[PDB]
């Protein structure tokens, strides 16, 4: 197809952005970055659609080219309109001192979770690879594309580190075993939150894990979509308010409209 | 010990000439084997054979990745290669019944197996070895077929 694709059409932009069908032809193609294209929430959508701080395209440009440095991701400045803010990222707006975390709700759209200052220092990281590096230095790699050196050696692959973004120092970690708390990054089970019942390894391809929530409904999903939220029943994150429990539309209609 | 070909045949990643081994006038003595970790037992013969097969999953660099097959061996006619046969019932929605279809997969046989025509083969997916062959033989199950191998239809 003669090389790389530089455009994205509105119809094809992920449902998670909640763009208007009728709003145009194109949408903003997420930039190459920490997160994949489909797991991206770009900045331009973050500002224009979600916060409404930008009313149109020009506006976004204004915010991100203003010498004043308005927007922050994991502590580091970003001027790129299509920067792929992904899952677990902490995005902070210097002028208002708003600190949000990027998440999926149970319905699988992108949400900004308002965080107080103590939350906003911390960010959750999930182990992708673990290796010996050059010079015989152990290293570890993360979903947000971090490379962390000299990890605590007990840290296994597919764990969750709690990362201090002020100190760039991993604080506490927990791994994928029975009894820990998860959030589910991708699935039809996207956004649900729960205690791991157990894990079955099929060893040819795809390992499936099962989950429960506070209410006691089971889930299953492939290992890749599990993200660990801490030890115990306690999560190290403030969840958008479903608390991670899915609601039957019956439950929804009942509680909302009193049926 | 058998060398018949234009080129001398030895496994890769195994050095035959080490100072201890030159003291023995006998071919080889240190052999390469492997584990292909799908829970597949590495055969007795892979271990004790003299065979050079660069396409053997046990004796070589062959990586078995992602797809596994059960089948019938219809033809062991060619050099270190068989054909396998998978029979299935394709469902025709309208007439609301099935239809008997078959597929022939060329598989690669490592010399470590004894393969009678009309046996039962397990094969793992493989990198493209030849024009036809994407599959390599893992496990042979012996069995007796009466009459020609073709007519015999097993859906398992």
């Amino acid at each position: 197809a003669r090389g790389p694709k530089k455009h994205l059409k509105r119809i094809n932009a992920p449902k998670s952005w909640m763009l208007n069908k009728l709003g145009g032809i194109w949408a903003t193609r997420p930039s190459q970055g920490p997160h994949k294209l489909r797991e991206s929430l770009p900045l331009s959508v973050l500002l224009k659609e979600r916060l409404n701080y930008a009313l149109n395209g020009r506006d976004v440009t204004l915010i991100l080219n203003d010498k004043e440095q308005n927007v922050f991701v994991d502590g580091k400045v970003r001027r790129d309109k299509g920067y792929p803010t992904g899952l677990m990222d902490v995005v902070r707006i210097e002028k208002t001192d708003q600190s949000f975390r990027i998440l999926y709700d149970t319905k699988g759209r992108f949400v900004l979770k308002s965080l107080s200052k103590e939350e906003a220092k911390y960010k959750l990281l999930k182990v992708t690879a673990k290796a010996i590096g050059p010079n015989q230095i152990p290293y570890i790699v993360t979903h947000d594309s971090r490379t962390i050196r000299f990890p605590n050696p007990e840290i296994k692959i597919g764990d969750t580190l709690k990362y201090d973004l002020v100190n760039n120092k991993i604080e506490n970690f927990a791994h994928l075993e029975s009894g820990n708390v998860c959030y589910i990054q991708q699935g039809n089970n996207i956004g649900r939150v729960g205690i791991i019942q157990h894990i079955e390894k099929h060893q040819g391809s795809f390992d499936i894990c099962h989950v429960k929530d506070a209410k006691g409904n089971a889930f299953a999903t492939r290992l890749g979509n599990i993200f660990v939220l801490g030890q115990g029943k306690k999560s190290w994150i403030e969840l958008p308010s479903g608390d991670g429990v899915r609601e039957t539309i019956l439950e929804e209609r009942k509680r909302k409209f009193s049926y | 010990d058998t060398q018949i070909q234009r080129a001398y045949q030895k496994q890769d990643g195994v050095f035959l000439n080490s100072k201890k081994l030159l003291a023995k006038k006998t071919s080889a003595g240190v052999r390469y084997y492997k584990n292909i970790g799908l829970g597949f037992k590495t055969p007795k013969e892979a271990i004790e054979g003299t065979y050079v097969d660069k396409k053997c999953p046990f004796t070589s660099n062959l990586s078995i990745r992602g797809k596994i097959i059960k089948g019938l061996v219809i033809s062991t006619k060619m050099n270190r290669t068989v054909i396998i046969r998978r029979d299935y019932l394709h469902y025709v929605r309208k007439y609301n019944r099935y239809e008997k279809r078959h597929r022939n997969i060329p598989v690669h046989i490592s010399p470590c197996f004894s393969v009678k025509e009309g046996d039962i083969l397990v094969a793992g997916q493989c990198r493209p070895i030849s024009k036809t062959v994407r599959f390599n033989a893992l496990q042979v199950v012996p069995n007796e077929i009466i009459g020609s191998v073709r007519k015999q239809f097993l859906l398992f």
Binding site: - | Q3, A7, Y8, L16, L22, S27, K131
Partner: protein, 207 residues
């Protein structure tokens, strides 16, 4: 304009297989480098000739047109030296390759003993080029540096083939590089089994 596409062949059944797209530049193959020994060629001024090749991804690949010297290893001894390659003796692929003196992987070549002869002499105090008066050891006994030269020599016994060859000063070695890619003839010296074999092959060709 050479092509590696599989589309230009018959599918398994024998059926003529259809074509919509063109030749694509990414299925490109490239002309062959017949890589030559300039060593014995008298008419040649330029003995070493290597071509950079701009490749997919902006990298380089290195074409050996003309080669004379290469880098060879002696396996038992773990000793690797660069020497001049003399002749291409046997080729399993095709014999017109031997006639054209072409270098390819698993070609069979001969090597100047000389660097290996010297390393051996240095290390074990034994000159392999000589028939009689084989031992070069120093005059002071009980001197750690001569003692070592004996202690080395104590365990060692060579193949008659390696010895005889060393005397001859030419050595049979099969070459392990891809000169049409790397731009090198790098190789290993034949020992034991492979030597029995390629000697016999050379021998029944010679018979």
């Amino acid at each position: 304009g050479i092509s590696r596409d599989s589309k230009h062949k018959r599918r398994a059944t024998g059926g003529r297989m259809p074509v919509h797209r063109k030749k694509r530049a990414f299925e490109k193959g490239r002309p062959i480098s017949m890589t030559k020994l300039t060593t014995q060629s008298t008419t040649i001024t330029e003995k070493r000739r290597i071509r950079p090749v701009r490749v997919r991804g902006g990298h380089l690949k290195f074409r050996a047109l003309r080669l004379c010297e290469g880098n060879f290893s002696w396996g038992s001894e773990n000793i690797t030296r660069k020497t001049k390659i003399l002749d291409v003796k046997y080729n399993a692929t095709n014999n017109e390759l031997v006639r054209t003196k072409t270098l390819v992987k698993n070609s069979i070549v001969e090597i100047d003993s000389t660097p290996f002869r010297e390393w051996y002499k240095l290390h074990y105090g034994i000159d392999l080029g000589l028939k009689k008066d084989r031992t070069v050891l120093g005059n002071k006994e009980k001197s750690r540096h001569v003692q070592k030269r004996v202690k080395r020599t104590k365990a060692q016994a060579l193949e008659k083939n390696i010895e005889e060859q060393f005397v001859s000063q030419r050595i049979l070695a099969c070459i392990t590089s891809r000169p049409g890619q790397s731009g090198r003839a790098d190789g290993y010296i034949l020992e034991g089994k492979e030597l029995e074999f390629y000697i016999r092959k050379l021998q029944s060709k010679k018979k």
